[PDB]
Design a protein around this ligand. Structure first.
Ligand SMILES: [Ca+2]
Ligand SMILES: [Ca+2]
Ligand SMILES: [Ca+2]
Ligand SMILES: [Ca+2]
Ligand SMILES: [Ca+2]
Ligand SMILES: [Ca+2]
Ligand SMILES: [Zn+2]
Ligand SMILES: [Zn+2]
Length: 576
């Protein structure tokens, strides 16, 4: 089946509209906090547009008026609140008023968020370095839909001493719960109970077996279900052929993993045919990456052939998705997986990684927000003899508030493309990056990779986790060359340092940039440089003399660097 959405020209098409910082009236002690120079010491460096509303004291509020033609009963809020001294987080709340009537007290926590950097590896307590992941999200449903002209106010109460921050609200109409399909099995048929705080994983496991035995859809009805360990769907020894698992909607069905330990939450698929998983919100009890040993991604392992995971909402996992087989020799692969119409946010590392030879697979029309490593990545690893991943696609996505690495990244293989994306407000990194720094296949047999039709805003950096600059588009020939890449119809707006950056010595071959518009660079004002002599941010920057790149129809405006380009001697740059 096709999960139909009329796509936007660039970015994802979602049912919410945004009520952002400058749309709000502030009062009662609320203040505007901003980081216009992108200084990562400031919490506001991680707010959208580097601006948010601080609610420091009882009575401080941010208030929005619903616009004509907008509204709804589903509200998402991007917020910040302090961590605890021991890094376990604090619990708190904010109050919601509609037209002056108190509607909700929304519980809040900093448990999931806050990661600390004194190296390129995060630490879990404030003693471990400088903070990132300072913002997080919650969502809730109103008893009645907000209507044009309504005012919705977020207000700090007398409950505690904590200073909260509110970045934005996103507001949407919530459809009713999706009906139980005919001749399906439900987790409640096997003892699961919604909303009782009791563990449902035994019932979920039994329901999977019954669905597979009967060939029936597995339905998860509306409500919150609690799973006290990893949900393993099939086993390596007894893999599942085909399975369909459907909830009642991202606003109705919540899967809450309750176990904070390593390898103790998320979903592990052991599927060889087609899985279809949809219409579910999932949350973790995870606050640490466990040094890449968390084994606690939202969706993991064997995704089969022409599978779909669509219309899901997942947050606070190690990664949103990690697609890749580590259990077979030679490795098996997912082929033709489609991830679409989904919200993959606030994870401690990658939003989605297509690894271990994952091929012909796609992430599209999705919101990829506030993740702690590459938003969407293809890592063509080769553990256990996995083949090179080829022909993966990241298109029509809105990728916002990345706080490590890049919004989109390719690390090897052939034929990947990323088109029609909107990439906004990266921190410590790039909208787009490629490198050859990781194990596995690189680009020697790449027939061509394409980036196109993409808008990049407020991205690039002067301070990644190595205290160095990165381009809004960053290409690094770390060991092997970057080869056969085309960028077409890219708008790069208000870049922090340099818009396009090339470096390391592995080589740059057949790199073409067509119809590029660069409007604003060097906006962070930083002049110190990891790689080179001091310089304002440029339109094009290289810190290697080994490479070539060709630009056709380049336009520039508002470039901090007076020379427009800052090219190391030896690099062959053509601009025509
Ligand atoms: Ca659907
Ligand atoms: Ca903002
Ligand atoms: Ca934390
Ligand atoms: Ca239960
Ligand atoms: Ca990563
Ligand atoms: Ca032109
Ligand atoms: Zn489906
Ligand atoms: Zn490590």
């Amino acid at each position: 089946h096709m999960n139909l959405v009329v796509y936007a020209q660039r970015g994802a098409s979602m049912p919410y509209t945004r009520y952002d910082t400058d749309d709000a009236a502030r009062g009662g002690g609320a203040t505007l906090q901003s980081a216009p120079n992108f200084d990562q010491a400031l919490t506001a460096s991680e707010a959208s547009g580097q601006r948010y509303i601080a609610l420091p004291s009882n009575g401080s509020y941010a208030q929005w008026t619903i616009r004509p033609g907008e509204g709804g009963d589903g509200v998402t809020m991007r917020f910040t609140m302090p961590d605890s001294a021991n890094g376990m987080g604090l619990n708190g709340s904010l109050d919601v008023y509609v037209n002056g009537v108190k509607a909700k007290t929304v519980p809040l926590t900093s448990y999931y968020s806050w990661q600390y950097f004194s190296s390129d590896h995060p630490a879990d307590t404030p003693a471990g370095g400088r903070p990132l992941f300072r913002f997080d999200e919650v969502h809730w449903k109103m008893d009645t839909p907000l209507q044009p002209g309504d005012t919705i106010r977020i207000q700090k109460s007398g409950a505690d001493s904590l200073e909260y921050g509110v970045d934005f609200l996103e507001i949407e109409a919530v459809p009713a719960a999706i009906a139980r399909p005919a001749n399906s099995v439900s987790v409640t048929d096997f003892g699961a109970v919604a909303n009782d705080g009791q563990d449902d994983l035994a019932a979920f496991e039994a329901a999977v077996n019954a669905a597979v035995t009967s060939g029936k859809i597995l339905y998860i009805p509306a409500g919150t279900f609690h799973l006290g360990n990893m949900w393993k769907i099939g086993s390596v020894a007894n893999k599942i052929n085909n399975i369909t698992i459907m909830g009642a909607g991202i606003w109705h069905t919540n899967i809450q993993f309750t176990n904070p330990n390593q390898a103790s939450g998320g979903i592990s698929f052991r599927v060889t045919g087609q899985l279809d998983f949809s219409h579910i919100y999932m949350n973790s009890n995870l606050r640490s990456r466990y040094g890449e040993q968390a084994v606690y991604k939202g969706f993991m392992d064997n995704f089969g052939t022409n599978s779909k995971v669509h219309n899901v909402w997942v947050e606070h996992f190690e990664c949103g998705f990690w697609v890749g087989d580590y259990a077979h020799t030679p490795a098996i692969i997912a082929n033709g997986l489609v991830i679409e119409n989904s919200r993959i946010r606030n994870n401690l590392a990658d939003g989605v990684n297509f690894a271990q030879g994952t091929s012909n697979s796609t992430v599209r029309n999705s919101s990829i927000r506030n993740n702690g490593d590459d938003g969407l990545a293809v890592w063509t690893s080769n553990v256990n003899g996995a083949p090179a991943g080829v022909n993966n696609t990241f298109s029509y996505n809105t990728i916002e508030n990345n706080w490590r690495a890049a919004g989109i990244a390719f690390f090897g293989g052939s034929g990947h493309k990323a088109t029609h994306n909107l990439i906004v407000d990266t921190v410590g990194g790039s909208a787009i990056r490629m490198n050859t720094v990781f194990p596995g296949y690189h680009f020697q047999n790449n027939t061509g990779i394409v980036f196109s039709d993409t808008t990049i805003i407020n991205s690039g950096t002067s301070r990644d986790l190595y205290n160095g600059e990165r381009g809004a588009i960053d290409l690094e020939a770390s060991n092997d060359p970057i080869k056969n890449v085309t960028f077409t119809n890219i708008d790069i707006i208000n870049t922090q340092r340099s818009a396009i950056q090339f470096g390391y010595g592995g080589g740059f071959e057949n790199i073409v940039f067509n119809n590029i518009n660069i409007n604003g660079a060097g906006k962070d004002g930083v002049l110190t440089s990891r790689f080179s002599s001091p310089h304002p941010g440029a339109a094009i920057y290289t810190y290697t003399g080994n490479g070539s790149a060709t630009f056709n129809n380049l336009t520039t405006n508002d470039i901090a660097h007076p020379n427009l380009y800052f090219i190391q001697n030896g690099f062959n740059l053509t601009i025509q």
